[PDB]
Amino acid sequence: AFTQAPMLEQNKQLPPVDQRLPEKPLVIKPIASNGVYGGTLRTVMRGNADGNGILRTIGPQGLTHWTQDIQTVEPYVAESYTVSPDAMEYTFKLRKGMKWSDGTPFTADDIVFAMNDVVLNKEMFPQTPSAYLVGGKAPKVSKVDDYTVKFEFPAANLSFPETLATPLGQHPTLYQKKYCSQFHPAYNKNVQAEFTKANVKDWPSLMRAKCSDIELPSRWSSTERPSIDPWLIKEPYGGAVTRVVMERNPFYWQVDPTGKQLPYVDRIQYAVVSDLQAIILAATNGQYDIEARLLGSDVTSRPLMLKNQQKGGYKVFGQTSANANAAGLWLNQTTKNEKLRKYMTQHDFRQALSLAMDRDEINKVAWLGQAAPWQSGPFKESKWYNEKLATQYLKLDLAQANQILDRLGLTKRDSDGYRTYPDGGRVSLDAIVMIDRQAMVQTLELIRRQWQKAGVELVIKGSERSLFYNRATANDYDISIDVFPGGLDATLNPRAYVAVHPLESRMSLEWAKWYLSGGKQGIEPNESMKKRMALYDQFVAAKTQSQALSLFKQILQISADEFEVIGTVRPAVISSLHSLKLQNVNEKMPFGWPYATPSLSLPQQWYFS
Incomplete structure (x- = not known):
């Protein structure tokens, strides 16, 4: 009934293809066209701790x-x-x-x-x-x-x-x-x-x-570990190797609609490259048949990627990231700064900070104009879209920011022009950031200059990863900058809307610790957050689709009302590429870890024309 790749037919020691396949193989409908067998998919990993690069190429087989x-x-x-x-x-x-x-x-x-x-x-x-x-x-x-x-x-x-x-x-x-x-x-x-x-x-x-x-190096470093993957490790991903090779699984369990046992492509070859710039150089010269993971975030590279398409023989395609915000401000409502905390916990103070921000400038300078202003909410293409959560307080309104801060009682200025607390002291917020995340550092530098015009001081505390996380878990920050998930994946990653992630719900990790400990540790959240946490427990255990929809929409609405986290821009389009010869890549697929992209596109039906 079924047919097989020539390199497996070349193998007389295999069982017949009908006996290697299940009785009822999964039939994969191609993205665009029925394919032909053969070839080596050339792609790339950065360093030797990039094993999810294999997983996101071949796909989890769940x-x-x-x-x-x-x-x-x-x-x-x-x-x-x-x-x-x-x-x-x-x-x-x-x-x-x-x-x-x-x-x-x-x-x-x-x-x-x-x-x-x-x-x-x-x-x-x-x-x-x-x-x-x-x-x-x-x-x-x-x-x-x-x-x-x-x-x-x-x-x-x-x-x-x-x-x-x-x-x-x-x-x-x-x-x-x-x-x-x-x-x-x-x-x-x-x-x-x-x-x-x-x-x-x-x-x-x-x-x-x-x-x-799932993510251990040992998943890809041996050749004897059986799997149901479309390709199998042949030259393994050791800690110092310079290349990885995978070859078709003769027992793969899928066919195309013509009865061909997949995958179409015989082999995958991963270059292991230490320097991201060398990956960009190779990619912009067409040396990878697919790169849809490493290069797409560095907006500095898009111009050269676009220009070199014809020379390299590849096509750039843009993907929408699942993240709602590329670099959002997480405001710590349990900050140890007691004078600041009196204002941090006021909605209108957070609103004023958002209105003092110039997201067009952040976009132009930090993202070469490729992003767009956004808060924290799901995108319009998501069933979870909430207009308020997405778009409130987005447009620069420095006059209204200063009006609010005046009304809150922050009118007295120090000798440098900054606002001060009634009890004395400059209105000053410490923002922690990972130093090697340049666009986020640059974003904070821009906000620092913008907030000066509202009389507010932003102190940038850049560091390496360990101190950045240790500061967060020690409750030693006023603002933390990092992505907001939820543009497409709000129920998979709800951390910006309800304080359930112990490392990343940085509107307060002490609130998250209270949630995760049944109230025995951490700090008791405010009523609006306790309500969302209760709604979240109800949502996870909802008995019907309709109940789940209602409960999670309620969480998002309360999050919008509270305005706890301040977005800068939703991510620019993720710039990915594939060789013009490589067929059946879904150029409309979203980008994200929850879908293990680009493997979402079914790489077992990619093929070379």
């Missing part, structure tokens, strides 16, 4: 997969799934006859092993990955038959199919029972014997070294 427009998911590794009307139980049907890369059967036993003996095993994971929890509670995972697996959660868990389409939700398909059980004491009663050979103290360390985890 139980479900995002649609191209990322509005929902469809069965992927699973042939089909069902959900109970209370949304607590998900049952997945697997593809009979599907095989791992080593030709052995892929069955419910593998999913149940991955969940019950790895993911939910507390020696392996003392903290269970949140992808498999609802309100912090784990499901019961059970084998129904050789090709059916059931997940039973203790509360409704409507987001689970979406979670299973993200890179962090792929554990269910990551662990082959046969191979991995060798390193597990419930199966290998002599496993302690493997420890010294592998230089490990315990079996979780052995399991991580041999069988790995």
